[PDB]
Amino acid sequence: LQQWKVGDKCSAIWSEDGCIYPATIASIDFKRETCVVVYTGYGNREEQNLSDLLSPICE
Numbered sequence: 001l002q003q004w005k006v007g008d009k010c011s012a013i014w015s016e017d018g019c020i021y022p023a024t025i026a027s028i029d030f031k032r033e034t035c036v037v038v039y040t041g042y043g044n045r046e047e048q049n050l051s052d053l054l055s056p057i058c059e
Helices: none
Strands: 009-013 020-029 034-039 044-049
């Protein structure tokens, strides 16, 4: 796990197409080790495991 906080910029693999997209963290559920990200400029959100988030440099 890396240290993440709500509002952090990150990138993540979108489950719809298996591609990396820029995202912002909208919420974190520390007990389940998940978060919700919003894909920046793509209008969509998704639950992600915190362990699966990537550097915001990956695009």
